Amino acid sequence: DAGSSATYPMQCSALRKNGFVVIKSRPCKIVDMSTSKTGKHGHAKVHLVAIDIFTGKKLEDLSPSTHNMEVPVVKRNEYQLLDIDDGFLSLMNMDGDTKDDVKAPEGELGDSLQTAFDEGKDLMVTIISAMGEEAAISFKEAARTD
């Protein structure tokens, strides 16, 4: 069919390391990039080596330098954890409500997170936003006073 948001449109020559890019319909952080000539004049090919912002599973891409590759937005949001339980996450917010969604332990991060939590401490957990589907990444600590 068709949707739906994000992304942007950006020319393949533009982006650089640490930037974000949708490759094979998957959002990735740019890890390495190059520019070969093959051509002829006046030409170059951008070779983007990029890790997906979720699983990791390294992705590559070879496009004309001129070519426009789709770039995703990334919201990094540091919401406070509340309860697990379960099932799942949960968090709370700044603010707010919320969520009901999110599930990632992962982990490593899983383990950590639960072991946590179960000890004590109220935790700060950032979540990353890929077009629609999301997930946690950082697990932290508050600095409470008033």
Coordinates of all heavy atoms in Angstrom, one line a residue, residues 71-105:
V71 N 16.2 9.1 5.0 CA 16.8 9.3 6.3 C 15.7 9.4 7.3 O 14.7 10.1 7.1 CB 17.6 10.6 6.3 CG1 18.0 11.0 7.7 CG2 18.8 10.5 5.4
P72 N 15.8 8.6 8.4 CA 14.8 8.6 9.4 C 15.1 9.6 10.5 O 16.2 10.1 10.7 CB 15.0 7.2 10.0 CG 16.4 6.8 9.8 CD 16.9 7.6 8.6
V73 N 14.0 10.0 11.2 CA 14.2 10.8 12.4 C 14.4 9.9 13.6 O 13.9 8.8 13.6 CB 12.9 11.7 12.6 CG1 12.9 12.9 11.6 CG2 11.6 10.9 12.7
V74 N 15.1 10.4 14.6 CA 15.3 9.7 15.8 C 15.0 10.5 17.1 O 15.8 11.5 17.4 CB 16.7 9.0 16.0 CG1 16.8 8.4 17.4 CG2 16.8 7.9 14.9
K75 N 13.9 10.3 17.7 CA 13.6 10.9 19.0 C 14.3 10.0 20.1 O 14.1 8.8 20.1 CB 12.1 10.9 19.2 CG 11.2 11.5 18.1 CD 9.8 10.9 18.2 CE 8.8 11.6 17.2 NZ 9.4 12.6 16.3
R76 N 15.1 10.7 20.9 CA 15.6 10.0 22.1 C 14.9 10.6 23.3 O 15.1 11.8 23.6 CB 17.1 10.3 22.1 CG 17.9 9.3 21.2 CD 19.2 9.9 20.7 NE 18.9 10.8 19.5 CZ 19.9 11.5 18.9 NH1 21.2 11.4 19.3 NH2 19.5 12.3 17.9
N77 N 14.1 9.8 24.0 CA 13.3 10.2 25.0 C 13.6 9.5 26.3 O 13.5 8.3 26.4 CB 11.8 10.0 24.7 CG 11.5 10.4 23.2 OD1 11.2 9.6 22.4 ND2 11.5 11.8 23.0
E78 N 13.9 10.2 27.4 CA 14.3 9.6 28.6 C 13.2 9.6 29.6 O 13.0 10.5 30.5 CB 15.6 10.2 29.2 CG 16.0 11.7 29.0 CD 16.4 12.2 27.6 OE1 15.7 11.9 26.7 OE2 17.3 13.0 27.6
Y79 N 12.4 8.5 29.5 CA 11.2 8.3 30.4 C 11.6 7.5 31.7 O 12.5 6.7 31.6 CB 10.1 7.6 29.7 CG 9.4 8.3 28.6 CD1 9.6 7.9 27.3 CD2 8.6 9.4 28.9 CE1 9.0 8.6 26.2 CE2 7.9 10.1 27.8 CZ 8.1 9.7 26.5 OH 7.5 10.4 25.5
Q80 N 11.0 7.8 32.8 CA 11.3 7.1 34.1 C 10.6 5.7 34.1 O 9.4 5.6 33.7 CB 10.8 8.0 35.3 CG 11.2 7.5 36.6 CD 10.9 8.5 37.7 OE1 11.2 9.7 37.7 NE2 10.2 8.0 38.8
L81 N 11.3 4.7 34.5 CA 10.7 3.4 34.7 C 9.8 3.4 35.9 O 9.9 4.2 36.8 CB 11.8 2.3 35.0 CG 12.7 1.8 33.9 CD1 13.8 0.9 34.5 CD2 12.0 1.1 32.8
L82 N 8.8 2.6 35.9 CA 7.8 2.4 37.0 C 7.8 1.0 37.5 O 8.3 0.7 38.6 CB 6.4 2.9 36.6 CG 5.4 3.2 37.6 CD1 4.3 4.2 37.0 CD2 4.7 2.0 38.2
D83 N 7.3 0.1 36.7 CA 7.2 -1.4 37.0 C 7.4 -2.2 35.8 O 7.3 -1.7 34.7 CB 5.8 -1.6 37.6 CG 5.7 -3.0 38.2 OD1 6.2 -3.3 39.3 OD2 5.1 -3.9 37.5
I84 N 7.7 -3.5 35.9 CA 8.0 -4.3 34.8 C 6.8 -4.7 33.9 O 6.6 -4.1 32.9 CB 8.9 -5.6 35.2 CG1 9.7 -5.3 36.5 CG2 9.8 -6.0 34.1 CD1 9.8 -6.4 37.5
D85 N 6.0 -5.7 34.2 CA 5.9 -6.5 35.5 C 6.6 -7.8 35.5 O 7.4 -8.1 36.5 CB 4.5 -6.6 35.9 CG 4.3 -7.4 37.2 OD1 4.5 -8.6 37.2 OD2 3.9 -6.8 38.2
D86 N 6.5 -8.8 34.5 CA 5.7 -8.7 33.3 C 6.5 -7.8 32.2 O 7.5 -7.3 32.5 CB 4.2 -8.4 33.5 CG 3.4 -9.2 32.5 OD1 3.9 -10.1 31.8 OD2 2.1 -9.0 32.5
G87 N 6.0 -7.5 31.0 CA 4.6 -7.2 30.5 C 4.0 -5.9 31.0 O 3.1 -6.0 31.8
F88 N 4.5 -4.7 30.6 CA 5.8 -4.3 30.0 C 6.0 -2.8 29.8 O 5.5 -2.2 28.9 CB 6.1 -5.1 28.7 CG 7.1 -6.1 28.8 CD1 7.0 -7.3 28.1 CD2 8.2 -6.0 29.7 CE1 8.0 -8.4 28.2 CE2 9.1 -7.0 29.9 CZ 9.0 -8.2 29.1
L89 N 6.6 -2.3 30.8 CA 7.9 -1.6 30.8 C 8.2 -0.5 31.8 O 9.3 -0.6 32.4 CB 8.3 -1.2 29.4 CG 9.8 -1.2 29.1 CD1 10.5 0.1 29.5 CD2 10.6 -2.4 29.9
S90 N 7.3 0.4 32.2 CA 5.9 0.5 31.7 C 5.5 1.9 31.2 O 4.3 2.1 31.0 CB 4.9 0.0 32.8 OG 5.2 0.6 34.0
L91 N 6.4 2.9 31.0 CA 7.4 3.3 31.9 C 6.6 4.1 33.0 O 5.7 3.5 33.6 CB 8.2 4.3 31.2 CG 9.1 3.7 30.1 CD1 9.3 4.5 28.9 CD2 10.5 3.4 30.8
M92 N 7.0 5.3 33.3 CA 6.1 6.4 33.5 C 6.7 7.5 32.6 O 7.5 7.2 31.7 CB 5.9 6.9 35.0 CG 7.2 7.2 35.8 SD 6.8 7.9 37.4 CE 6.6 9.6 36.9
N93 N 6.4 8.8 32.9 CA 7.0 9.9 32.0 C 7.5 11.0 32.8 O 8.0 10.9 33.9 CB 5.9 10.4 31.1 CG 4.8 9.5 30.8 OD1 4.2 8.9 31.7 ND2 4.4 9.4 29.5
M94 N 7.5 12.2 32.2 CA 8.0 13.4 32.8 C 7.1 14.0 33.8 O 7.2 13.7 35.0 CB 8.5 14.4 31.7 CG 9.5 13.8 30.7 SD 10.8 14.9 30.1 CE 11.9 13.7 29.5
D95 N 6.1 14.9 33.5 CA 4.8 14.7 32.8 C 3.9 13.6 33.3 O 3.4 13.7 34.4 CB 5.0 14.6 31.2 CG 4.3 15.7 30.5 OD1 3.1 16.0 30.9 OD2 4.9 16.3 29.6
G96 N 3.9 12.5 32.6 CA 2.7 12.0 32.0 C 2.0 10.7 32.4 O 1.5 10.6 33.5
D97 N 1.9 9.8 31.4 CA 0.8 8.7 31.5 C 1.1 7.2 31.8 O 0.3 6.7 32.6 CB -0.3 9.0 30.4 CG -0.6 10.5 30.3 OD1 0.3 11.3 29.9 OD2 -1.8 10.8 30.6
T98 N 2.1 6.5 31.3 CA 2.5 6.2 29.9 C 3.9 5.7 29.9 O 4.8 6.3 30.6 CB 2.1 7.2 28.8 OG1 0.7 7.1 28.5 CG2 2.9 7.0 27.5
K99 N 4.3 4.5 29.3 CA 3.5 3.9 28.3 C 2.6 2.7 28.7 O 2.3 2.6 29.9 CB 4.5 3.4 27.1 CG 5.8 4.1 27.0 CD 5.7 5.3 26.1 CE 7.0 6.2 26.2 NZ 6.9 7.4 25.4
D100 N 2.2 1.9 27.8 CA 1.6 0.6 28.0 C 2.5 -0.3 27.1 O 2.7 -1.5 27.5 CB 0.2 0.6 27.4 CG -0.7 -0.5 28.0 OD1 -0.5 -1.7 27.6 OD2 -1.6 -0.2 28.8
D101 N 3.0 0.3 26.0 CA 3.9 -0.4 25.1 C 5.3 -0.5 25.7 O 5.5 -0.4 26.9 CB 3.9 0.3 23.8 CG 4.3 1.8 23.8 OD1 5.5 2.1 23.7 OD2 3.4 2.6 24.0
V102 N 6.3 -0.8 24.8 CA 7.7 -1.1 25.1 C 7.9 -2.4 25.9 O 7.1 -2.7 26.7 CB 8.5 0.0 25.9 CG1 10.0 -0.1 25.7 CG2 8.0 1.4 25.7
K103 N 9.0 -3.1 25.6 CA 9.2 -4.4 26.2 C 10.6 -4.8 26.5 O 10.9 -5.7 27.3 CB 8.6 -5.5 25.3 CG 9.2 -5.6 23.9 CD 8.8 -7.0 23.3 CE 9.7 -8.1 23.8 NZ 9.4 -9.4 23.2
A104 N 11.6 -4.1 25.9 CA 13.0 -4.5 25.9 C 13.8 -4.2 27.2 O 14.4 -3.2 27.4 CB 13.7 -3.9 24.7
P105 N 13.8 -5.2 28.1 CA 15.0 -6.0 28.5 C 16.1 -6.1 27.5 O 17.1 -5.5 27.6 CB 14.4 -7.3 28.9 CG 13.0 -7.0 29.4 CD 12.7 -5.5 29.0

